[PDB]
Amino acid sequence: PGLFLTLEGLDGSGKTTQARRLAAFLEAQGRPVLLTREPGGGLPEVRSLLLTQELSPEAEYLLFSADRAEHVRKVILPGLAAGKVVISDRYLDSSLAYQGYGRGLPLPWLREVAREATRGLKPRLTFLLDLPPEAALRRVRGLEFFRRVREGYLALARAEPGRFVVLDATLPEEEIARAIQAHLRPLLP
Amino acid sequence: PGLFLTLEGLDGSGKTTQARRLAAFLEAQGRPVLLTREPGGGLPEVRSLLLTQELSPEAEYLLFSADRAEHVRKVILPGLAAGKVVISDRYLDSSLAYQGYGRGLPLPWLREVAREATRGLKPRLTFLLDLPPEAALRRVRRPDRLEGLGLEFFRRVREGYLALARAEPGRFVVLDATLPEEEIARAIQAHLRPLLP
Ligand SMILES: Nc1ncnc2c1ncn2[C@@H]1O[C@H](COP(=O)(O)OP(=O)(O)OP(=O)(O)O)[C@@H](O)[C@H]1O
Ligand SMILES: [Cl-]
Ligand SMILES: [Cl-]
Ligand SMILES: [Cl-]
Ligand SMILES: [Cl-]
Ligand SMILES: [Cl-]
Ligand SMILES: [Mg+2]
Ligand SMILES: [Mg+2]
Ligand SMILES: [Mg+2]
């Protein structure tokens, strides 16, 4: 039993908003739900090292992967074992987009590290809230970096189009929330 | 038991090619398959009746519905009951796009008629092979039932499909039909991986 779902996208794309909308929707149907996030979901103390004095991208990813390893084993898998819909605000795909396409780290190395960290656990669906960097920076707070990240997410979507549900994040919140519920309707329970 | 899949788009979009390709893939993996199509899957002779002097759109839809009524009861539902993957080249969305948005018949009437014709049966997934109608028209000639229709007809049909996709985004899997044939076959395969099983 259980159903693992993730929300993905740039900063200010609406991940947390749609994650909370989905949680409350499933909760209103009386379904068990575990809303979680990355980083912090497995090892909460890793979030302090995110805001650390000029941390290298390789070390940053390995901290993410340590947290994600603990997140999978002690929170997500038990949640799935208990029949919950586990929704994670960010997952592996965040690291692949930001570290791989954004910062430039080799993808085979990232996937090699992730293979044992994640225990092979892929989301059943991943909802990619896609919008341009210019719109993303207006929502949340160089644009060349976020352009590579955006293209990375689409490259990952192109590689796994069954898993990735690509949605226009500039659409209204209701229209996006209604669409996410439509993609999940047949998967429940 | 069973899994009901449909493919949609303009003729020349590649939905026929991909429908045939999907069936061979499932046959190759030892999965029972029923490849079918509309118009003709229920009542073959309806294809001939669609070529009539100056057939009205109301009669035309009702011929499609009579055909589809029989297609659901005689072919699809028996197929699904037996555990088969039923692949239909065109289903109800074709009538909605071509006779609704194209010819201009009211959508509420079409959906009310379809409710008993289809027995409420919706496919688990519908693969829409989307492309511009100018691109579709250049690839293959239109079927004889659609003879003497301008570019603006097929634009309304193209946009009608996309409107249906917005209303049912879970069911519809919209694909770019200007991509390579292998890439579209790979994408259709990937969407069906967790459903087959
Ligand atoms: N569909 C929408 N249309 C317009 N604005 C939206 C929409 N969805 C969310 N927002 C707004 O955009 C901002 C970003 O939302 P949210 O924090 O959920 O994105 P996020 O991806 O979680 O950001 P971060 O990655 O920084 O945590 C918020 O102020 C929110 O109100
Ligand atoms: Cl996939
Ligand atoms: Cl075709
Ligand atoms: Cl339908
Ligand atoms: Cl072309
Ligand atoms: Cl839907
Ligand atoms: Mg957030
Ligand atoms: Mg990372
Ligand atoms: Mg789609």
Swiss-Prot record, chain A:
An example Gene Ontology molecular-function term: ATP binding
PROSITE patterns in the cross-refs: THYMIDYLATE_KINASE
Family matches, as Gene3D superfamilies: P-loop containing nucleotide triphosphate hydrolases
Domain of life where this protein originates: Bacteria
Listed InterPro entries: P-loop_NTPase, Thymidylate_kin-like_dom, Thymidylate_kin_CS, Thymidylate_kinase
Cited CDD domains: TMPK
Catalytic reaction list: dTMP + ATP = dTDP + ADP
Family matches, as Pfam families: Thymidylate_kin
Binding positions for ATP per the UniProt entry: 9-16
GO cellular component: cytosol
EC number: 2.7.4.9
Keywords for this protein: ATP-binding, Kinase, Nucleotide biosynthesis, Nucleotide-binding, Transferase
Principal EC category: transferase
GO BP annotations listed: dTDP biosynthetic process; dTTP biosynthetic process; dUDP biosynthetic process
Entry function: Phosphorylation of dTMP to form dTDP in both de novo and salvage pathways of dTTP synthesis.
Family that this chain belongs to: Belongs to the thymidylate kinase family.
PANTHER family hit by this protein: THYMIDYLATE KINASE, UMP-CMP KINASE 2, MITOCHONDRIAL
Protein name: Thymidylate kinase
Gene: tmk
